[PDB]
Structure formats: C-alpha cells, structure tokens
C-alpha cells in the first residue's frame, strides 16, 4: 500500500505450505486471489489450447528408470554465467507479483535468495529496485526489459538495472503486442497499481491500464540491432527471451546475445503455436553449445526439469507455481515451492541414475509417439 | 403483421457487438434465431465429425512466434483478380440470410462493402440482385451459381449476374445432392421464403421446400464441359468451389477455371471426409501458382487466416461467424465480425514477423503429429 | 411368440420406421426389447473397446468429395456369385432373431427378400428352414454352419440347407469358444427358446442354455480339412468367415474356399484385437482377386459401404442395425433399415463421383494418421 | 491382534468370488478395505498417468483371431527355471498383503500353491515365514529383497531365504528412493505392520525399519557389483527387477543375473515414464534368450498374458488384481482371480490358434499406431 492500492486486496499471510504437487496450487490460489488478478495470472491466449500443449508436451518424451547406477546423494547444484546456484532453476521474470501477495516482488525475492538461486526482475514490477533489493539481501538478480520506443529511456532503465546489481539483461521479444487473453478481455481486467520502473514511458500510471495498452506503449519494431545495442550499452550478458524457432536462436547469437531463453511466455502470447518443450531439441541442436539455454513455459515437476536438461537446457525458469505459492504463503509459500522442485528433482535424479546436474544432461529419453492419451 | 411472412421471426435489431472470439457467437445467436433456421445454419452432415475435423485441422500445423523481425504496424491489405481488399478474406456465398436477420443479404452486403472486401452472392439468396445492390452501394461482388439443368436459364442467370456487376462467377459443384444433415431432417427444416434468382427452375417458389428438393432441381450431372461453357459465356473468371482432391483442381484449370476454391461446404456435404485445411497443401502444390486459391471451411481465428496463406491460399472465405454476427446485430453485427478478423490477423502478423500479407505466405509452420489432444 | 420362450416378451408390432441414422436405433430398440436379449444383441467382448474400434476404424480412411464427374442417377446394383442384388450389401448370419421380434427370422427374411438381396441363415436360428422359407418367398439365401463335432450330422445339416435352397455355405470359424461377453455374464443370459437346426448335437434344447455351452457343443478343432470337406460334400461355394489375418485368407483359398468373409463377429469374439475395417486392405492385397470378399463388423452408414468397396470388398454384410430395425418394426422396420442403407449409399456415390458400384471400387481414400480425435 | 502392529481393520472373510473382469475388483475391494490402506494398494506416482500408460499400452499391439488352426483344448502349463507351473503367471513380490486381508501373505500363498504356481515372497512381508510356509504347504517360492546398506545384513537375509527353501532371489532395484505417491501423502497413510521375516537381521540405518522408511533406510548406491555379490553369495538364480531400459538388462546379465524382471513397480516408482509393456520388446531383443524374462505392471486380462508372451516374456507376474481378490475373499478370493486368469488365457489361446504356451510365443501382433482412442 503506497500510492496504488485501492479495493484490490491481495493475500498478506506469510506461512510455509505443504506442496504435494504444483498443479493443486492453482485451484488453491483461486480461493485466495481476487478474481481479476487470479485469472490474469492463470489464464492464457485463446481457449488455452497452447497452455495445455505446454503441459502435455512433457508426455512426448518419457524418462527411463535406471538401476545399479552407483548413485547416492544427488547434488542439484549447478552454475550459469558465473553464478553458483542450489538447483538448475531460476525465477522467471513475471510482472504480477502484487496481484498475488501484498509483499509483491520483495516477497518472491526473499524466497529466491534464501533458496539460493537467481531472481529475474520484470520491467513491469509493481515494486521498485529498492524494494526488491531489500528482499534479495544481496542475492543475484537479472533484469528483464520491455523496450521503450525511446532509446534514451532504454539506456536509463538499463543503467538503473546495472546500478541496482543486475548481472544479466533479459530481452523479452515475444510481446511486441499482447496475446489474445480471453479471460482478461471477458473480465475487463485492469492493473490495480503502478509499474515504477517503466512509468517514464506510459501516458499516466499503469494503474488504470490494460496490458494491451502497456505493450503497445513498448517497442513493436524490435530488430537484431536492438540485441546488439543492448549488449553494447549494458556491460552485461544478454538473453533473448521468447524463442521457439531455431533460426531466431542463430540470429540472436550472431547479433551478440550471450544466452537463449526458450519460451512461449507461458502460452500468454501467440495462440495455436507448439508446446514449448517440443521446440527445445531443435533450438538446442542449432545453438550447439554456443551460449547457455534457459528453458521455460510449462515446468511443474522435477521430471520436467530433468527432461529439459536432457534435451539441451542449462537451467529452467519457474513461473506460475512460484506465484501461486506466493499467493498462499508470501515469501515462505514461494520458498515452499522452490524447495518442492529441489526435492522433486532429487527423487528423479536418484531413480534415473543421475549423481549430479551434468549426468541429467546425458539422459536418453523414451519417445512416445502416442501422445497424451497413449 | 408483415405480408411476406407466415410466421418465421428472424431478429431485426441492428448494433455493433463485442467479439472476444467467434466460437461464442454460435451459442449467442442460438438465443435469437428461430430453432429450425438456427440449426440449418449451425448444423452439418452426420454426427458432424467432419465439422469438428475442419476445426481440429488447424492444430495439425502450428505457428511459430518470431522475434526481432523488423516489423511494426502490419498491413492486411491484398489484391485478388483486380480487387484491392482491406484484408485477405472475402464473404463466402451463403443461402437465405433472412434465416439470420430481417435485413438478410442487404445487411450482409452492407457490412462487407463498408469493411472493404468482396461479397459473394449465393444463387439461393432470399434477396434479389437489386436488393443486394442497395446494400453493396457499388462494392465488389462475385456471383455463385447453382446451375439450372437448362442451358438457357444458366445463360440468363449469368447475364443477370454480370449485368448486376459480378466480376467473377463461382461454380459450386459439391452439392449435386444434399449432405445428410441430421439436424434439418429431425427439425423437418423447410425454407420460410422464396429464392428469386433460382425460382425460374423450381416447380414452386421455394417457400415451403426442403433443401433436398431445391438441390436436385439444380444440375446433378455437372461435367468439365460446364466449367468451359460458363467461362465461355460469361467472360468472367470462374472459380470451381468445393475442391478437396488435387486432381479436381488440375481438371478445373484445364477446363478453363481462373480460380480454385478449396472447401467442403463447411462440412454440410460429404460426411466422413477430411477437415478442409488438411487438403489444402496438396491442392496448392498441384495448382502450382496457375490460378489463385480461395480457401474455406472452418476459419474462426486470425491464426487460421495466416495458416491458410502460409499453406497456399491467396485469401480465405468466411461463413458461419459472419452470419451469426448478422443474427446478433444486422449489418453492424456482421461488420463487428469482419473487424474482429482484421484485428485478430494483425496481432498474428505482428507476432509471426509478417509486415504484410505476402510475408504471411512465406511462413514455415510447425508440424504437430500428435493430434488435437497432443 | 413361439412354443419355446421361458417367458420372453419380444416386440410384435410391424411398421415402417423413420431412419435418420442407424446409431439412434440402438437406444430406441433398448426401450422395447427385454433387458437380457437386448444386451445380448448390443453387447461385445470385454469393455467393448474393439466394438468401439470397429466404429472408429472408419475415420482412418476418409472419402474425398469429387466434382464435375459426370454423374447423375447412381446405380447401387451389383452381382455376387451369380446373384443380382439391389445394393452391394447382404444380411449377415445372426443367431438372435426372436430375441428382437416375435416374427423372428421369418420377419428378417421377408425384409431382405422384398428389398432384393441375400439372406444369411445362422445355424443358431430360433426358426426352422420351413419357417424362414415362407418369409423368403423363393428369395436367395446362404446358410451359415456352426459345425457339429460329428461328420454325419454336418452332412445332414448341409443337405437340409441345400435342399432348402442355399446357394452358398458360410463356415464361421472365429467362435470355437465364446468371446468374454461381460453384459451376458453379468445378466446371466440364457436363450429363452430353442435352436431347431443344431438341436441334434446339443443333446437337449438351446432353451435355458448359455451361449458358452452351445458353442462348446459345436466343433472346436476346425482345421483346413473342414473347409475342403464342406466344399466337397455340399455342391456349394464355401466362405470362411471371421478372417482378420491375411495368412488365413490364403490358407482358406488353398483349402477350397470360394470366398473370404472378413469379420471379427461384431467384436463379440476375440477382445483387444483390431477394428475390422483396419484389417481389410491387407487381406484384400493377399487375396488379390482370387475369390470374392464379403466384409463385416461395424458397417453403420453408406460411407462405410463405399469405404469397404474402395478397399477391396465385393459386398458388405449388415447386422445389428437391421436387427434393431426388426425389434422396432418387424419386417417393415428391418426393411426401413435396408432401404436407408440403399439411399445413404446413393448419396455417397453421387458426392464421390461414382455412377455405379464398380466406380466405388476405384476410389482413392484420404489417409488420416490422427485418430478419431483428429 | 498382534500388540506390536498398529490397529488396522482389514477384511477377514474367506469365500470364492465371481470374477467377470479384474478391473471391477478395484471398486469392489474399495468397499471393504480401510480407505488409507486401499489407496496405498490402488494408487500410483503423481497423477497416475504412468499407471494409466501401463493399462493403455496393451492397446498398442492387438491380437489377431486365427482360424482353422486345428486347436482344441489349450494347455496353459509352462516351466521357468525348472519349476513346472499351471499357467504362465506367478505372484509378484508385494510386502503389503495385510492391507487387503487379515491372513496377509499367508492367504495369498495358499491361493498360489493351491492353484499351482510360484509365490514371490517379499522379505518385508507382514506375515511370519512360518505363517506363509503353512499357507504354501510345500509349494514353490521365490524371495524378494532390497539391497541393505549393511553387507552382513544382505548375507543374513539371503541365508534366511535359502534356508526357507527359496529357489530364486529377486533383487528389486527400482526403489532406491520412494515414488511420489500423492494418494498416500494426501491421506497421511502410515503402514501398520512389522517385518517379522527380516526383523532381527536389521542393522545400522535399517534398525527400526518399516515399509514407511524402507527405500531411504536401504541401499541407494546399488552398483553392478551388488548384483555380482548377491549372485555369488546366494546359491541361487537372481532376478533383477524394475528394468525398463535395455542397457540395464545387458548390465544385469553381465553382472551375473540369472533373469530379467521387466517392471515399473505398478507405476509406484518413477513418474512420467513409459507404460511397462511398451518397454518389453526392446529389452527382449537385447536379452536375446540369454536368461528368462518375467514381465509385470498392468496385467489384467488373459489377452495381456498372451501379448507379453508374444513380445518375449517367459511368464508374467500378477499384483493388484490378486490383492483385490484377497480383500474380497481371503485365499479363496485370491484363488478365484488366479483361476479367472487361467480361464481368460485359455479362451485367448483357442481364438488365437495356440495349443500350448509355446505357440503363444510365436504370435504376430497387429501394430496400432492410433492410440487408445483409435
Ligand atoms: C502472471 C504472468 C506474468 C508474466 N509477466 C512477464 C513479464 O513481465 N516479462 C516476461 O518476460 N515474461 C513474463 N511472463 C512469462 C514468464 O517469464 C514465463 O515465460 C512463464 O511464466 C512460463 O510459463 P509457466 O509459468 O506456465 O511455466 C509472465 C507470466 C505470467 C504467468
Ligand atoms: C448457412 C450456410 C449456407 C450456405 N449456403 C451456400 C450456398 O448457397 N452456396 C455455396 O456455394 N455455399 C454455401 N455455403 C458454404 C459456404 O460457402 C462455405 O463453404 C462455408 O460456410 C465455410 O464453412 P464455415 O462457415 O464453417 O467456415 C453455406 C454455408 C452455410 C454455413
Ligand atoms: C446378435 C448377434 C448374433 C450373431 N450371431 C451370429 C451367428 O449365429 N453366426 C455367425 O456367423 N455370426 C453371428 N453374428 C456375427 C454377425 O454375422 C456379424 O459378423 C456382425 O453382426 C457384424 O457386426 P455388426 O452388426 O456390428 O455390424 C452375430 C452378431 C450379433 C450382432
Ligand atoms: C501395494 C503395492 C506394494 C508393492 N510392494 C512391492 C514390494 O514389496 N517389493 C517389490 O519388489 N515390488 C512391490 N510392488 C510391485 C509389484 O511387485 C509389481 O511390480 C506390481 O504390482 C505390478 O503392477 P500391477 O499390480 O499393477 O500389475 C508392490 C506393488 C503394489 C501394488
């Protein structure tokens, strides 16, 4: 509650939560988050066929159990762009957080730094860098930009992020206009508070505004020059985020990207597009070790983390389930989810004969041509 | 008391409507359209498995989002057979618009004309040429014939169509007898008004007749000679409509057709046949640029428009959604649907990196061998 | 009803019926046929997945509409083994009939005879040859044997069939023991009346016996020798019925069979087996024109008839739909079903460009690798 | 009651039961077994998609009915490792029979020896060996272990099994940690019984062990040396159980395994893995006759037994259906299930043309590329 908060009443309770599986968290969160903001978080484009595809894609490649593999206390730690992290997942950049919990991004930040991974800060955060920093307590962070049409504004934002301690920049390029998000349209959803970091290029405050109008204020005519100019201007490794087609990965690397972030924005953008995990092997094969790959869009289980790594990702990024955890328990709730994914992965590692994160990368997967219904 | 009717009570309200997606228009229209007429419009052959196939076919080939493309305010305009149109879609020829709205084909014509595309006029209109002309106000029109058995009556229909200003003729050849339309059979659907363009070759004057008997007063024994003779007589470009097999595209072109219209009649004809979109690539490859291709049967989204163009259609034709929009709001309801399609396509163009309609034609699509269920 | 029934109240009413599709006939028949007999007729082995397979197989190969073909009043007539028949379908041998209607096999016989096709008489009829002959009125018939273990009894049965007027013998070889018919097990189904043709080797009545014990009385150790011997003894062309594997077709033909009858007994026999129509092309390719093929198991629509002919069958045999028609209206109800199939096929011929039954045999079908769910 | 067990209200009645199919037994047993313990038996990892895969896999390869095969009274008997058994299925090792019935493993042992097959005894069974031995009354038995961390404990348990007359050892190696069994977590289920067969050999991390913490307390770091050592120390043929990947079959054999036991532990272990049946042919082809194969996980029908044998298994092992039978009627209920499988297989054998169990191994199966939904 600052200049924004009105009749939007986000949960405020802080507690650890029992996570049996992350799927149940959606319905659980529907009972604590205001209808508009909940459906903004949970919903996807069209009739959500592609979000369902993100989920069902994991049944296309199945894990073998493996035995007498000489493996005992699996270690989930890994390293990406110099950061040593407790497990091979990071927090995806997500604009929402105040929609889910009054402690907002600072809540998520505390869970992420206490767990021991990397926080990605969305340009569309409801919290300032200062507020997020207090939650991170010096933990690592990456900053995600939605580009302004005005170059000076981009250079200011990047300077603020770097000054704040960002050690990579995430260029989200799959959102030059909004997806067709039927739930938000039908609800007439509107952000109930401000976006302090991108404020400088919105007609007024984000507060009364639709997402369609926030994107749209952003840069539509993103080109490979933008990738080069952001890497050049910031001193920092640049990820290009939203990639589903291998030619865009070759393009981004040749334009100076230091990482490829394979994603379909959790199916919130282009409708009637593939499940994200289905696109990963061809992108990995084109990238061919040139830069690290972050994978997201549909990760719900430790099995999914293992499959992504076997298929070419260095790490995955987590989204909705952590935000559902934040709704239900603030920072401790979000931490419960992160802790669930580590323990879930540890079980999968033991059963697949994987001693460490590198072993996961060499797993052979069973191909399932029958799909979901088998 | 309106002296023309016995008792069919079509909606008459004129207003713009919201359109979140075109699928919802179906149930909304069922609320205002008399039962028999509504189910004539919505229904299809058999248990409607092929109507479902028309819709599920769109998931067989998926769009890639593409980033850093160098794209900003896409332009949906295109040209076909000399007509500059505002978007790469036209109005499909559909019988008896009076079943949907009291303004009938004049209402449709007004929406189509004002939006900026081509009107196709069904030989089975409940409206005269002069009535539809008042709606078009000089806008482009194509005339779709259901042939008479008698050559002179076809010459006369063609002469009237051309005198009215028709700039192409559409020979619909997939309806030599009716499909097995179970809804219409169970409702005992009969037309509540006459059809002035084809009245000449009906024994009666269409009002209490079944479609079964109307088709079937029309010509059953269509042969490639009819294509030659229609082309010869009415020296306008001829489309052969209803094509699903590539051999028929080649046959029609060699018989003098100037266009191929790929369609299964919105699944109202042959049952247990493929979804129309699945047939398109093979027809396009056989046509091999010789004449333009119109594609229809199941187009509901901008994504579908894009996939059709990427797969070799020059434009698509829209049917049910526009007629539902007419039911709900007369010319303004129909206009709202066309406007929806233009804006829906624009988003898709932006997210796929397509600056113009030509760029759409060059899109690679992701093959999805899993089905609808993924 | 006859002098056997324990207390079985079969319908007796004789009327023509409106058939919109044959699938609705199943539920309509359930309202008038006693529970036990109804589920004996409608049911299949296990959880009926293979009966479902029989029906869904028809979606694996899809018909193309064809246009400007030069076609007008399609002729359904054909000829098999010297019989000129009105349409390319015959009556399958069915041991039910008095379970469906008090007029029994004589009622079905009258419908088939008046329609103008071939009646197949089951060895497990609840009617005598003389009873069936009065219904047939000189109409053509084929006799289906369930073999006795004793040779002499088989000779006696074949002689009675031939002296009755049988012009072919159908050896059903796929029922050496009963399928696992869950409905009949749970209903404790037992025949309410006798089976006069095979009574000689039952040592008793079929009345109050289970199908398991009746099948148990017929011959289990059928070998190729039985094919040779039946052909040798009778004057007659012998079909082997129940064939799903191409090697059995080659075997049957080399053992003296004059026809191959592709069937899985309407899924009443071996469970977790393919849909019948999926097995047909490989049998046809191996038969390679040597003898005529009859196809059954799942035929519900004129499209199914077309597909089977296009895939190598000379005729199809009809079963459950006709018996449901019999339950509903006696011979007139059975007739309404035959007449429906004739008209249904006529529509399909016109839409596919088939002037006659030979033209159907040359149709190409579209392969649908996606399932039923598309 | 044993004062040392947690109170648990298992069924105690003993009666033969009617078995129409094994699937209906699950629901029937749910009415008499305590909720927690019932769901422990019935449930599986995650949302149970891999348990469903186990069941749907059987629809990937379909049986052909075969005719004129000269077959009459099929013989289900077979032999494995010198044991002559009445049918090609054995009891799978399961430690939790007392959850189904108060007679625990002694009840199932009675059914299994009365029927004439092999009883697999979990070392961690609820019943005492003397109780189980009384049930077996001399019948053949195999013993299943987990590797303990403590080597001496392994030697002691193996000696115990050999002195108890075990003629083979089953090393279950797919459970180095527990699967994610949502039902048990959600039900807060605590397994109630002790482990009298091995209590007393329990050392170190295994001290105070129960099924509640077996997995964690036993050996995680199993290597091929464990297999060698077990085979070396024991006199006996050793099966390695839980194999789904062909490399693991080759490893186990090269390490001295006398048998490969293909299994996913009834889907109670690794989630989002293939259905067990789908893994079988690749394992069989790699084994290539070196040692016998036991197959389990999803066997519910005689058709499944036949498909497994056709696909390279020597025998299958049964689990859940036998426990549901034990719940419903003690040893006689369990016996009714074994007897059902024997009759079910006999019918399949007759209809596939298989005179004996060797013939089943020669069966060609029909590949069904469409899925379960056909
Ligand atoms: C509530 C919501 C808000 C999001 N906001 C952003 C954003 O500000 N910037 C961005 O790059 N991605 C954003 N994303 C996309 C995520 O970074 C990520 O791609 C997505 O959450 C992965 O899908 P999943 O959560 O279903 O696994 C958002 C996603 C959701 C769920
Ligand atoms: C209500 C209705 C009437 C139609 N009438 C005609 C007609 O008179 N002539 C014609 O060529 N096609 C006619 N069609 C077929 C359409 O031209 C077009 O093929 C179909 O609407 C496309 O399928 P869709 O509307 O589901 O997208 C009709 C379709 C429907 C919905
Ligand atoms: C009620 C019932 C009884 C049958 N009785 C016999 C029979 O006595 N002899 C035989 O060869 N086939 C018999 N059949 C199999 C049929 O000949 C035929 O293969 C089956 O009806 C085709 O399946 P469909 O009716 O589902 O299309 C019977 C089928 C059913 C429906
Ligand atoms: C309740 C339950 C407990 C089990 N306990 C063991 C165990 O003690 N040791 C073992 O090797 N397998 C165990 N299994 C796996 C079985 O040996 C067998 O692999 C499984 O039951 C096969 O799956 P199905 O029962 O669904 O056909 C258990 C399975 C279930 C059903």
PDB file of N, CA, C and O in Angstrom, chain A residues 267-302:
ATOM      1  N   UNK A 267       2.333 -19.451 -22.655  1.00  0.00           N
ATOM      2  CA  UNK A 267       1.209 -19.563 -23.570  1.00  0.00           C
ATOM      3  C   UNK A 267       0.320 -18.313 -23.522  1.00  0.00           C
ATOM      4  O   UNK A 267      -0.813 -18.321 -23.944  1.00  0.00           O
ATOM      5  N   UNK A 268       0.883 -17.218 -23.030  1.00  0.00           N
ATOM      6  CA  UNK A 268       0.134 -15.970 -22.894  1.00  0.00           C
ATOM      7  C   UNK A 268       0.282 -15.089 -24.127  1.00  0.00           C
ATOM      8  O   UNK A 268      -0.321 -14.011 -24.172  1.00  0.00           O
ATOM      9  N   UNK A 269       1.041 -15.565 -25.129  1.00  0.00           N
ATOM     10  CA  UNK A 269       1.291 -14.755 -26.301  1.00  0.00           C
ATOM     11  C   UNK A 269       0.679 -15.413 -27.530  1.00  0.00           C
ATOM     12  O   UNK A 269      -0.527 -15.544 -27.552  1.00  0.00           O
ATOM     13  N   UNK A 270       1.463 -15.857 -28.520  1.00  0.00           N
ATOM     14  CA  UNK A 270       0.878 -16.397 -29.761  1.00  0.00           C
ATOM     15  C   UNK A 270       0.136 -17.708 -29.485  1.00  0.00           C
ATOM     16  O   UNK A 270       0.697 -18.634 -28.888  1.00  0.00           O
ATOM     17  N   UNK A 271      -1.129 -17.727 -29.899  1.00  0.00           N
ATOM     18  CA  UNK A 271      -2.045 -18.843 -29.803  1.00  0.00           C
ATOM     19  C   UNK A 271      -1.848 -19.814 -30.972  1.00  0.00           C
ATOM     20  O   UNK A 271      -1.371 -19.403 -32.027  1.00  0.00           O
ATOM     21  N   UNK A 272      -2.187 -21.101 -30.763  1.00  0.00           N
ATOM     22  CA  UNK A 272      -2.152 -22.111 -31.823  1.00  0.00           C
ATOM     23  C   UNK A 272      -0.731 -22.312 -32.384  1.00  0.00           C
ATOM     24  O   UNK A 272      -0.511 -22.511 -33.586  1.00  0.00           O
ATOM     25  N   UNK A 273       0.186 -22.291 -31.422  1.00  0.00           N
ATOM     26  CA  UNK A 273       1.607 -22.438 -31.518  1.00  0.00           C
ATOM     27  C   UNK A 273       2.006 -23.742 -30.775  1.00  0.00           C
ATOM     28  O   UNK A 273       1.228 -24.264 -29.955  1.00  0.00           O
ATOM     29  N   UNK A 274       3.202 -24.295 -31.057  1.00  0.00           N
ATOM     30  CA  UNK A 274       3.581 -25.536 -30.335  1.00  0.00           C
ATOM     31  C   UNK A 274       3.706 -25.452 -28.804  1.00  0.00           C
ATOM     32  O   UNK A 274       3.933 -24.373 -28.283  1.00  0.00           O
ATOM     33  N   UNK A 275       3.596 -26.606 -28.112  1.00  0.00           N
ATOM     34  CA  UNK A 275       4.018 -26.689 -26.702  1.00  0.00           C
ATOM     35  C   UNK A 275       5.486 -26.343 -26.601  1.00  0.00           C
ATOM     36  O   UNK A 275       6.266 -26.777 -27.430  1.00  0.00           O
ATOM     37  N   UNK A 276       5.884 -25.554 -25.606  1.00  0.00           N
ATOM     38  CA  UNK A 276       7.273 -25.019 -25.588  1.00  0.00           C
ATOM     39  C   UNK A 276       8.349 -26.120 -25.607  1.00  0.00           C
ATOM     40  O   UNK A 276       9.338 -26.028 -26.339  1.00  0.00           O
ATOM     41  N   UNK A 277       8.157 -27.157 -24.795  1.00  0.00           N
ATOM     42  CA  UNK A 277       9.162 -28.232 -24.682  1.00  0.00           C
ATOM     43  C   UNK A 277       9.390 -28.962 -26.032  1.00  0.00           C
ATOM     44  O   UNK A 277      10.509 -29.387 -26.340  1.00  0.00           O
ATOM     45  N   UNK A 278       8.357 -29.060 -26.849  1.00  0.00           N
ATOM     46  CA  UNK A 278       8.509 -29.628 -28.196  1.00  0.00           C
ATOM     47  C   UNK A 278       9.496 -28.909 -29.086  1.00  0.00           C
ATOM     48  O   UNK A 278      10.030 -29.538 -30.014  1.00  0.00           O
ATOM     49  N   UNK A 279       9.708 -27.612 -28.821  1.00  0.00           N
ATOM     50  CA  UNK A 279      10.599 -26.792 -29.646  1.00  0.00           C
ATOM     51  C   UNK A 279      12.043 -26.847 -29.159  1.00  0.00           C
ATOM     52  O   UNK A 279      12.957 -26.441 -29.876  1.00  0.00           O
ATOM     53  N   UNK A 280      12.253 -27.343 -27.953  1.00  0.00           N
ATOM     54  CA  UNK A 280      13.571 -27.202 -27.329  1.00  0.00           C
ATOM     55  C   UNK A 280      14.706 -27.965 -28.077  1.00  0.00           C
ATOM     56  O   UNK A 280      15.730 -27.363 -28.340  1.00  0.00           O
ATOM     57  N   UNK A 281      14.535 -29.270 -28.389  1.00  0.00           N
ATOM     58  CA  UNK A 281      15.631 -30.044 -29.030  1.00  0.00           C
ATOM     59  C   UNK A 281      16.156 -29.411 -30.322  1.00  0.00           C
ATOM     60  O   UNK A 281      17.363 -29.358 -30.522  1.00  0.00           O
ATOM     61  N   UNK A 282      15.276 -28.908 -31.194  1.00  0.00           N
ATOM     62  CA  UNK A 282      15.764 -28.273 -32.434  1.00  0.00           C
ATOM     63  C   UNK A 282      16.513 -26.954 -32.160  1.00  0.00           C
ATOM     64  O   UNK A 282      17.449 -26.602 -32.882  1.00  0.00           O
ATOM     65  N   UNK A 283      16.090 -26.207 -31.150  1.00  0.00           N
ATOM     66  CA  UNK A 283      16.808 -24.966 -30.816  1.00  0.00           C
ATOM     67  C   UNK A 283      18.167 -25.361 -30.233  1.00  0.00           C
ATOM     68  O   UNK A 283      19.197 -24.817 -30.627  1.00  0.00           O
ATOM     69  N   UNK A 284      18.184 -26.308 -29.303  1.00  0.00           N
ATOM     70  CA  UNK A 284      19.454 -26.754 -28.707  1.00  0.00           C
ATOM     71  C   UNK A 284      20.455 -27.236 -29.753  1.00  0.00           C
ATOM     72  O   UNK A 284      21.700 -26.966 -29.643  1.00  0.00           O
ATOM     73  N   UNK A 285      19.934 -27.947 -30.764  1.00  0.00           N
ATOM     74  CA  UNK A 285      20.797 -28.533 -31.806  1.00  0.00           C
ATOM     75  C   UNK A 285      21.369 -27.401 -32.692  1.00  0.00           C
ATOM     76  O   UNK A 285      22.528 -27.452 -33.103  1.00  0.00           O
ATOM     77  N   UNK A 286      20.558 -26.371 -32.965  1.00  0.00           N
ATOM     78  CA  UNK A 286      21.055 -25.175 -33.676  1.00  0.00           C
ATOM     79  C   UNK A 286      22.045 -24.333 -32.847  1.00  0.00           C
ATOM     80  O   UNK A 286      23.102 -23.891 -33.328  1.00  0.00           O
ATOM     81  N   UNK A 287      21.705 -24.094 -31.594  1.00  0.00           N
ATOM     82  CA  UNK A 287      22.619 -23.379 -30.695  1.00  0.00           C
ATOM     83  C   UNK A 287      23.963 -24.136 -30.590  1.00  0.00           C
ATOM     84  O   UNK A 287      25.046 -23.530 -30.699  1.00  0.00           O
ATOM     85  N   UNK A 288      23.889 -25.457 -30.441  1.00  0.00           N
ATOM     86  CA  UNK A 288      25.080 -26.303 -30.463  1.00  0.00           C
ATOM     87  C   UNK A 288      26.164 -25.772 -29.535  1.00  0.00           C
ATOM     88  O   UNK A 288      27.312 -25.556 -29.959  1.00  0.00           O
ATOM     89  N   UNK A 289      25.796 -25.530 -28.272  1.00  0.00           N
ATOM     90  CA  UNK A 289      26.766 -25.174 -27.214  1.00  0.00           C
ATOM     91  C   UNK A 289      27.324 -23.729 -27.271  1.00  0.00           C
ATOM     92  O   UNK A 289      28.098 -23.345 -26.387  1.00  0.00           O
ATOM     93  N   UNK A 290      26.928 -22.934 -28.271  1.00  0.00           N
ATOM     94  CA  UNK A 290      27.490 -21.566 -28.410  1.00  0.00           C
ATOM     95  C   UNK A 290      27.251 -20.677 -27.182  1.00  0.00           C
ATOM     96  O   UNK A 290      28.148 -19.948 -26.778  1.00  0.00           O
ATOM     97  N   UNK A 291      26.040 -20.725 -26.614  1.00  0.00           N
ATOM     98  CA  UNK A 291      25.681 -19.932 -25.418  1.00  0.00           C
ATOM     99  C   UNK A 291      24.776 -20.799 -24.561  1.00  0.00           C
ATOM    100  O   UNK A 291      24.221 -21.785 -25.068  1.00  0.00           O
ATOM    101  N   UNK A 292      24.645 -20.467 -23.261  1.00  0.00           N
ATOM    102  CA  UNK A 292      23.648 -21.162 -22.404  1.00  0.00           C
ATOM    103  C   UNK A 292      22.177 -21.006 -22.820  1.00  0.00           C
ATOM    104  O   UNK A 292      21.783 -20.016 -23.427  1.00  0.00           O
ATOM    105  N   UNK A 293      21.381 -22.019 -22.480  1.00  0.00           N
ATOM    106  CA  UNK A 293      19.980 -22.012 -22.768  1.00  0.00           C
ATOM    107  C   UNK A 293      19.225 -22.083 -21.447  1.00  0.00           C
ATOM    108  O   UNK A 293      19.537 -22.906 -20.579  1.00  0.00           O
ATOM    109  N   UNK A 294      18.272 -21.173 -21.305  1.00  0.00           N
ATOM    110  CA  UNK A 294      17.294 -21.200 -20.257  1.00  0.00           C
ATOM    111  C   UNK A 294      16.030 -21.689 -20.969  1.00  0.00           C
ATOM    112  O   UNK A 294      15.710 -21.208 -22.070  1.00  0.00           O
ATOM    113  N   UNK A 295      15.355 -22.661 -20.366  1.00  0.00           N
ATOM    114  CA  UNK A 295      14.045 -23.091 -20.877  1.00  0.00           C
ATOM    115  C   UNK A 295      12.919 -22.707 -19.920  1.00  0.00           C
ATOM    116  O   UNK A 295      13.040 -22.935 -18.730  1.00  0.00           O
ATOM    117  N   UNK A 296      11.804 -22.189 -20.440  1.00  0.00           N
ATOM    118  CA  UNK A 296      10.573 -22.143 -19.643  1.00  0.00           C
ATOM    119  C   UNK A 296       9.302 -22.423 -20.451  1.00  0.00           C
ATOM    120  O   UNK A 296       9.368 -22.647 -21.680  1.00  0.00           O
ATOM    121  N   UNK A 297       8.178 -22.434 -19.712  1.00  0.00           N
ATOM    122  CA  UNK A 297       6.793 -22.497 -20.185  1.00  0.00           C
ATOM    123  C   UNK A 297       6.260 -23.895 -20.004  1.00  0.00           C
ATOM    124  O   UNK A 297       6.268 -24.685 -20.935  1.00  0.00           O
ATOM    125  N   UNK A 298       5.776 -24.180 -18.789  1.00  0.00           N
ATOM    126  CA  UNK A 298       5.046 -25.431 -18.534  1.00  0.00           C
ATOM    127  C   UNK A 298       5.698 -26.299 -17.469  1.00  0.00           C
ATOM    128  O   UNK A 298       5.157 -27.322 -17.114  1.00  0.00           O
ATOM    129  N   UNK A 299       6.832 -25.871 -16.926  1.00  0.00           N
ATOM    130  CA  UNK A 299       7.540 -26.658 -15.865  1.00  0.00           C
ATOM    131  C   UNK A 299       6.730 -26.724 -14.543  1.00  0.00           C
ATOM    132  O   UNK A 299       6.457 -25.690 -13.910  1.00  0.00           O
ATOM    133  N   UNK A 300       6.355 -27.939 -14.154  1.00  0.00           N
ATOM    134  CA  UNK A 300       5.521 -28.187 -12.957  1.00  0.00           C
ATOM    135  C   UNK A 300       6.104 -29.260 -12.013  1.00  0.00           C
ATOM    136  O   UNK A 300       5.667 -29.393 -10.865  1.00  0.00           O
ATOM    137  N   UNK A 301       7.063 -30.038 -12.501  1.00  0.00           N
ATOM    138  CA  UNK A 301       7.563 -31.207 -11.770  1.00  0.00           C
ATOM    139  C   UNK A 301       9.055 -31.345 -11.893  1.00  0.00           C
ATOM    140  O   UNK A 301       9.648 -30.862 -12.871  1.00  0.00           O
ATOM    141  N   UNK A 302       9.668 -32.068 -10.953  1.00  0.00           N
ATOM    142  CA  UNK A 302      11.086 -32.346 -11.105  1.00  0.00           C
ATOM    143  C   UNK A 302      11.416 -33.149 -12.362  1.00  0.00           C
ATOM    144  O   UNK A 302      12.468 -32.977 -12.928  1.00  0.00           O
TER     145      UNK A 302
END
